[PDB]
Amino acid sequence: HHWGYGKHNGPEHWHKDFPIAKGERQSPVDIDTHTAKYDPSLKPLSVSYDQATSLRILNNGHAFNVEFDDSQDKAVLKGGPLDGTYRLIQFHFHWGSLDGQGSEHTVDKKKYAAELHLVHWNTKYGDFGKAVQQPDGLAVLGIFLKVGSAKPGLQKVVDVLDSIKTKGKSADFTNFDPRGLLPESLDYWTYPGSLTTPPLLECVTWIVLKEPISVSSEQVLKFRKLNFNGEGEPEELMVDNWRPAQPLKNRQIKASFK
């Protein structure tokens, strides 16, 4: 009885094994655009992904992660509300069984078809495992996906998913450039929050971009053919791997733009 996204082990159960589920700075949240405060003190984000080295893609039974070499400052995020340099370790997505749900964060209660998470850790803490124990340890860039036109830069990801269909499977995944996943604008909302899967630690500065990217229905269809299970246990499709919005409680969302 591990955690997952079903009736009997899904997000409403997580608090029994991970009491921080009901904590004060849980994610995701609904971003109320009329209540978010423009903060002209916020700098532009600086994304330096020119030297990124992807290594591997894997199905971990809750999502698929693309993992990067984080042994040096090769793909980093700086600026914005951040102090210091945050190194890219992995990205993954959350998505739905249908196009009208899938994102974790919502914008004035609107759900998108999926959500991309680029996970970065603060180099002052030396490694990811020490970083997750700190209130400013991680920075996650969240990018919404809507269904319309194809995103060419995502196709390389979609084509390998056949090779990692079940939990535990991995494949070599070199020379992927994450710059092909960014929207045009880097305007953003930011708030302090948590990992959205167990162990749900409250170590994340969230940076959620205003502008969604478009993907095609055929591209998102392929995400939905993955499996939560291992080979061959009974087939459970990897769909609806998102946590619902949590209470904002004592937190302000700030916007980089008006």
Q: What are phi and psi of 82, to 5 degrees?
A: -90, 145
- What is the smallest separation between the CB atom of 95 and Zn ion, expressed in angstroms? 11
**Residue 117 annotated as binding?**
yes
Can you tell me which residue has the tokens 């269909």? Answer: 165
* 15 noted as active-site residue: no
- What is the smallest separation between the CB atom of 122 and Zn ion, expressed in angstroms? 18
- Active-site entry in 13, 15, 34, 62: 62
Which residues form the interface with Zn ion (CB under 5 A)? 117
CB neighbour list of residue 153: distance below 8 Å, 6 or more residues apart: 177, 179, 180, 181
- What is the smallest separation between the CB atom of 63 and Zn ion, expressed in angstroms? 7
Of 35 and 199, CB closest to Zn ion: 199
**Residue 15 annotated as binding?**
no
Q: Which residue is nearest to Zn ion (CB)?
A: 117
Q: What is the DSSP letter of 143?
A: E
Gap between the Cα atoms of 204 and 147, Å rounded = 28
Question: b or e along 26-49 (b: 16 or more beta carbons within 10 Å of the residue's beta carbon)?
Answer: bbbbbbeeeebeeeeebeebebeb
**Residue 94 annotated as binding?**
yes
Gap between the Cα atoms of 66 and 58, Å rounded = 7
**Residue 8 annotated as binding?**
no
Of 25 and 117, CB closest to Zn ion: 117
Of 90 and 256, CB closest to Zn ion: 90
- What is the smallest separation between the CB atom of 94 and Zn ion, expressed in angstroms? 6
Helix ranges (DSSP H) in the chain? 128-131, 155-160, 217-223
Active site residues: 62
